[PDB]
Amino acid sequence: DEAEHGLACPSYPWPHKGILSSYDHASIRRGHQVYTEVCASCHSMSLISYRDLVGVAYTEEEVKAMAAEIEVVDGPNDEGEMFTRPGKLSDRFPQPYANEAAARFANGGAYPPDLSLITKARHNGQNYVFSLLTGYRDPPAGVSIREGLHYNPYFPGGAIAMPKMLNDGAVEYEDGTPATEAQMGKDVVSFLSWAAEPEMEERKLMGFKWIFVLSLALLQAAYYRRLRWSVLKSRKLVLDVVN
Amino acid sequence: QSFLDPKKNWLAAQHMKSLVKRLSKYGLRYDDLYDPYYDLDVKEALNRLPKEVVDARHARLKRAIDLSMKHEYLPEDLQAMQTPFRGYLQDMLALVKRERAEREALGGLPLYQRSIP
């Protein structure tokens, strides 16, 4: 039962966890870079457009260039044929494979899930993704995994079909920060957390404001109720009865 | 009844003590808990009861409701003078129920029926 349930993942001190804590946008940019470098060859993020990265991790010109360096198909032209053109600001992230069947055929019968909502589609999303990425280790003495499958304790079932892709020095960061396995895992999880919840900062700001304002409202409402009920709760009643 | 008598049963005695303590806090008798809108036999019994008794019951109910609204109980002296379980409604309620039972047994029609809500 332990193997099929999977190893529990520890609670991590994420930079975007807290009442007044935001995303580390530098880490968002690094995570996007490592994703497009060593993670977009198998996985897809169909819910994220290029315009989503403007003002979050890249400038508008940077996103325009990043979208132009890829080619996407467009609808029929005047001749009725289908053509390909460089991508624009509003284009979605390209899909590595044509469809689910092609993905399963290329990845040995396993479908790499969409990464748009992966931190929200798993219990303990951020910690689980980080542990799965950085927790490829030798199987315990007694269990044998088949060829083509790699052992990951945190994956439900013990055996995962995704090879260990987070290796030291895989992606050369433009910031100059070390390309450590843990660093790339943290950056990837931060980028995926942003992709799943791009509204976190605005949501937290609005929530703090309304919680404070409504606490003041609760104080005023209690005062108003006690003032209105003051005549009833501070009255003397003579009734001519003793028992 | 055997087990319901506080003298022969310890559990019944503790229940009676707790009930007396609960009733004396708000200063209303057990029969005050009976609702005229509940059975309408309580309504008929209170109609047949004397005006002094009905007025005293209403005053006790008003005092209990006011105390509940104020989130306070009767003072210690009034709680001591409180005498719950001094019945005033049980006998007339039993008489009304007996009259209703004999009316039902000898054909007849109900003198009052609860309106369909």
Binding site: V241, V242, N243 | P50, E52, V53, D55, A56, R57, D77, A80, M81, Q82, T83, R86, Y88
Partner: peptide, 14 residues
């Protein structure tokens, strides 16, 4: 104090 006797108050007497 003590509870009133059953022949002390008007409602109790009635």
């Amino acid at each position: 104090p003590a509870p009133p006797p059953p022949t002390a108050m008007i409602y109790d007497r009635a």
